[PDB]
Amino acid sequence: KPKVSLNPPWNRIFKGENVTLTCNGNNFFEVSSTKWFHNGSLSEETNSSLNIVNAKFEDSGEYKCQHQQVNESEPVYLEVFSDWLLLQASAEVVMEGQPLFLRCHGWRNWDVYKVIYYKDGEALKYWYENHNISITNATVEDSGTYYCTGKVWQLDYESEPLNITVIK
Ligand SMILES: *[C@@H]1O[C@H](CO)[C@@H](O[C@@H]2O[C@H](CO)[C@@H](O[C@@H]3O[C@H](CO)[C@@H](O)[C@H](O)[C@@H]3O)[C@H](O)[C@H]2NC(C)=O)[C@H](O)[C@H]1NC(C)=O
Ligand SMILES: *[C@@H]1O[C@H](CO)[C@@H](O[C@@H]2O[C@H](CO)[C@@H](O)[C@H](O)[C@H]2NC(C)=O)[C@H](O)[C@H]1NC(C)=O
Ligand SMILES: *[C@@H]1O[C@H](CO)[C@@H](O[C@@H]2O[C@H](CO)[C@@H](O)[C@H](O)[C@H]2NC(C)=O)[C@H](O)[C@H]1NC(C)=O
Ligand SMILES: *[C@@H]1O[C@H](CO)[C@@H](O)[C@H](O)[C@H]1NC(C)=O
Numbered sequence: 344k345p346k347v348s349l350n351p352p353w354n355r356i357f358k359g360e361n362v363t364l365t366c367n368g369n370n371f372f373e374v375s376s377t378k379w380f381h382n383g384s385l386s387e388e389t390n391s392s393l394n395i396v397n398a399k400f401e402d403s404g405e406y407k408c409q410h411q412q413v414n415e416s417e418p419v420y421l422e423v424f425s426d427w428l429l430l431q432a433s434a435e436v437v438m439e440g441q442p443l444f445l446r447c448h449g450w451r452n453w454d455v456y457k458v459i460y461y462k463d464g465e466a467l468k469y470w471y472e473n474h475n476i477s478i479t480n481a482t483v484e485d486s487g488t489y490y491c492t493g494k495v496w497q498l499d500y501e502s503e504p505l506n507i508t509v510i511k
């Protein structure tokens with residue numbers, strides 16, 4: 344029962360950014376026989392750590408790993424974007440009580456100011472130099488649709504809206 348982990352945790356990334364997919368293993372692993380299935384199609388890497396460099400739209404997809412005698416892991420979907428601001432979430436679905444981190448991500452990792460996060464059309468939090476609205480203990484009422492607004496350079500921008508569900 345393997346489980347694909349990511350680093351950054353962000354599973355919604357811009358174009359050209361890099362992400363690393365590690366197969367069920369927190370720190371140190373042994374085997375050299377690891378399988379990767381990008382969109383189902385077997386991959387060319389064997390190492391347990393499948394890196395992804397300059398993010399091309401084609402990288403967006405469904406992945407998974409399996410060992411010699413283990414049933415393939417629950418696929419994970421990676422989406423790549425091109426836009427001024429992208430709203431990133433730790434996980435999109437959560438178990439009541441778990442942690443939750445949302446991030447109003449600027450393009451080219453620039454700097455965003457006058458930030459405001461919104462949940463279900465309501466103003467929620469606000470800062471100058473931006474922040475990362477974080478949640479330790481997650482309530483089910485936290486489930487909703489978020490999006491953020493901010494000033495890049497000297498213009499305002501709105502982010503694509505994102506759904507989030509906290510089940511019990
Ligand atoms: C795995 O399957 C997914 C299908 O969801 C593939 O992702 C899709 O890839 C295409 C081509 O990169 C994306 O569309 C492109 O968008 C640009 C910009 O809007 C446009 O100018 C191009 O003409 C093209 O339409 C498409 O949106 C994307 N799907 C999603 C949801 O992001 C992915 O490429 C597949 N992986 C492999 C290795 O085939
Ligand atoms: C993705 O990885 C690349 C490679 O490490 C990063 O760009 C590197 O930038 C350094 C400058 O310190 C150069 O020495 C390398 O040659 C560059 N690598 C490549 C492949 O061009 C890049 O910054 C990473 N992406 C992000 C978002 O940080
Ligand atoms: C987020 O979830 C909401 C539902 O909570 C989706 O909105 C519904 O969309 C369907 C069809 O698009 C409509 O029939 C419903 O009336 C909508 N509900 C509301 C309250 O507007 C929404 O499409 C989802 N968005 C994403 C990005 O997944
Ligand atoms: C290759 O695998 C080892 C562990 O077997 C790991 O420490 C290392 O980071 C991996 N290298 C790459 C490029 O994935």
Ligand SMILES: *[C@@H]1O[C@H](CO)[C@@H](O)[C@H](O)[C@H]1NC(C)=O
Pocket residue numbers: 344414
């Ligand atoms: C492993 O996969 C087989 C089918 O190939 C399935 O019967 C079995 O239940 C799986 N292992 C576990 C722990 O579920």
Ligand SMILES: *[C@@H]1O[C@H](CO)[C@@H](O)[C@H](O)[C@H]1NC(C)=O
Pocket residue numbers: 446474475
């Ligand atoms: C908060 O978000 C920023 C983005 O500006 C990121 O670089 C940083 O690592 C995050 N801080 C923490 C403590 O996770």
Ligand SMILES: *[C@@H]1O[C@H](CO)[C@@H](O)[C@H](O)[C@H]1NC(C)=O
Pocket residue numbers: 440480481482
């Ligand atoms: C999380 O918060 C709930 C109340 O909202 C509380 O009952 C529970 O003990 C908290 N969990 C932890 C680990 O403190």
